[PDB]
Design a protein around this ligand. Structure first.
Ligand SMILES: OC[C@H]1O[C@H](OC[C@H]2O[C@H](O[C@H]3[C@H](O)[C@@H](O)[C@@H](O)O[C@@H]3CO)[C@H](O)[C@@H](O)[C@@H]2O)[C@H](O)[C@@H](O)[C@@H]1O
Ligand SMILES: OC[C@H]1O[C@H](O[C@H]2[C@H](O)[C@@H](O)[C@@H](O)O[C@@H]2CO)[C@H](O)[C@@H](O)[C@@H]1O
Ligand code: GLC
Ligand code: GLC
Ligand code: CA
Ligand code: CA
Ligand code: CA
Ligand code: NA
Length: 481
């Protein structure tokens, strides 16, 4: 067993040129050489416009195959182009995880007149008006697809709520459809966080429950997926999501189907809750670790690096942790902007890539850069960290998370991977050394900094210890020369 490494193969500000699937296909053998074992690709189905990033879901049966919303292709390309890309990933032994967006729909084909009440955006449980008629965007007819793959049409009675009355056109409102209840169990911020945006799917209605589990089967079968990435799980009835996932595993026979959910909450408690209510059947993005990386990045050297891993899925539930530094939602100008500055980013990526805890995820925005926000590509130095992970980050780990500035850990090596073993050392502050145990096995061997940040070498004494230096505000990853 080789280490596993995910890559989010998109960012928010990609150009709308229908080329991402093409590119992903080409990149397959390159991704294999740098140690990517799995690729998370963005919502592949038709959004409300050609340029939609994917979260403005229109038709989940249109993988850029049908002419709807004025385009055949999605922002990313055609069903044909996606299938070639997935084949190419598979030919290079890389897993394909599809982004699955179940919370809502938008770009309804027409309005329906329906009775609804206003609820309080701070407390969706509290009603704030009498019933009355609104013009709600709840009619999904799918005219360019007709009945190919599914004749299921969405109407008002399949949604719990909307944020727009077309007849009166008012901001700041959340409408609950008459005789509907916000689903449960959901995140309890705003009393009930079932409603986020668009037309909120009612996961109480059992026609919806069995249609969405069919969609699941069709999606995973049609693209031959190894896994799913689940958008907005905090806003979706936990029991249904737990059964949605075991239904798809069962109906497809992919019973080892990988699943990671976006539960966006800075509190480990909330995440633990979601895991408990879903039988630990899926992993979660380590959002608390991301927040810690940001705090250290903005600490100007004064963050207490001993606390870097506190209150994280990485430390506390490593088998269900998907670790990340930044994503499409945290990048500059997006909704959860919490960017990790350039100087700290290598310390963060060294943390998720050289430690035994977590399934780490490399951001496309980091690897290839974000031109629209003047972010350099980090590919040159990331390649060296990914080399460390692929070929050296193996065997017993020893942790030295024991100073405000300088911290480190070692990996002894396993016999399965030749020459394997490393010592990672990093400082949020001035440069220094740590004496750490890499194993008596390595005695007399000479270590180099695979990052290139330092040109000196460390000789391992016969007790199996080295004294490993790093630069100020940098990281060095030491391996057998
Ligand atoms: O119209 C609704 C909303 O849309 C965007 O929000 C995007 C993100 O919403 C969720 O995250 C919320 C957190 O769960 C709350 O803790 C708090 O921090 O607020 C954010 C949203 O502002 C969701 O879980 C993420 O996947 C979404 O991308 C807009 O930016 C909001 O201003 C709108 O209210
Ligand atoms: O008729 C124009 C356009 O109106 C809507 O766009 C809304 C959106 O739905 C609301 O959720 C909110 O953000 O205000 C926007 C203001 O323009 C419709 O949803 C859309 O289908 C329609 O074409
Ligand atoms: O954390 C487990 C993951 O590790 C690796 O990428 C495997 O290839 C994948 O199947 C597994 O789901
Ligand atoms: O906190 C609000 C919640 O209280 C209870 O748990 C109800 O069962 C649920 O339907 C409601 O929204
Ligand atoms: Ca409901
Ligand atoms: Ca919802
Ligand atoms: Ca410090
Ligand atoms: Na709902």
């Amino acid at each position: 067993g080789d280490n596993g490494t995910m890559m989010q193969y998109f960012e928010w500000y990609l150009p709308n040129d229908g080329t991402l699937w093409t590119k992903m296909g080409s990149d397959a053998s390159h991704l294999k050489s740098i140690g990517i074992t799995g690729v998370w690709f963005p919502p592949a189905y038709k959004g409300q416009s050609q340029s939609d990033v994917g979260y403005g879901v229109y038709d989940m049966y249109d993988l850029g195959e049908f002419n709807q919303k004025g385009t055949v292709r999605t922002k990313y390309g055609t069903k044909a182009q996606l299938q070639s890309a997935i084949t190419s990933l598979h030919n290079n032994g890389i897993q394909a995880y599809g982004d699955v967006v179940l919370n809502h729909r938008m770009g309804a084909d027409a309005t329906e007149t329906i009775s609804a009440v206003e609820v309080n955006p701070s407390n969706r449980n509290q009603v704030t008006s009498g019933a009355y008629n609104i013009s709600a965007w709840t009619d999904f007819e799918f005219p360019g697809r007709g009945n190919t793959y599914s004749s299921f049409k969405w109407h008002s009675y399949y949604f719990d709520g909307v944020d727009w009355d077309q007849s009166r056109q008012l901001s700041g409102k959340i409408y609950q459809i008459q005789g509907k209840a916000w689903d449960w169990e959901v995140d309890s911020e705003n009393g009930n966080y079932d409603y986020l945006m668009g037309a909120d799917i009612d996961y109480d209605h059992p026609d919806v429950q069995t249609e969405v589990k069919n969609w699941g089967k069709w999606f995973v079968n049609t693209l031959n997926l190894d896994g799913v990435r689940l958008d907005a799980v905090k806003h979706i009835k936990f029991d249904y999501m737990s059964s949605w996932l075991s239904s798809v595993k069962s109906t497809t026979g992919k019973s080892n189907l990988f699943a990671v959910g976006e539960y966006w909450n800075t509190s480990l408690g909330a995440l633990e809750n979601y895991e408990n209510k879903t039988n630990w059947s899926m992993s979660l993005f380590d959002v608390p670790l991301h927040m810690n990386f940001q705090a250290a990045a903005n600490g100007g050297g004064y963050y207490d690096m001993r606390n870097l891993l506190n209150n994280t899925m990485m430390k506390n539930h490593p088998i269900q942790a998907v670790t990340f530094v930044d994503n499409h939602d945290t990048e500059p100008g997006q909704a959860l902007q919490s960017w990790v500055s350039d100087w700290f980013k290598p310390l963060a990526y060294a943390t998720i890539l050289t430690r035994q805890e977590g399934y780490p995820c490399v951001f496309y925005g980091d690897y290839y850069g974000i031109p629209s926000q003047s972010v350099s590509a980090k590919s040159t130095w990331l390649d060296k960290q990914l080399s460390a992970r692929k070929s050296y980050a193996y065997g017993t780990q020893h942790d030295y998370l024991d100073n405000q500035d300088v911290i480190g850990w070692t990996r002894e090596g396993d016999s399965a991977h030749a020459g394997s073993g490393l010592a990672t050392v990093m400082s949020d502050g001035p440069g220094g050394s740590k004496t750490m145990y890499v194993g008596t096995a390595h005695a007399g061997q000479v270590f180099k900094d695979i990052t290139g940040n330092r040109t000196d070498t460390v000789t391992i004494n016969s007790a199996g210890n080295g004294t490993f230096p790093c630069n100020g505000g940098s990281v060095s990853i030491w391996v057998k020369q």
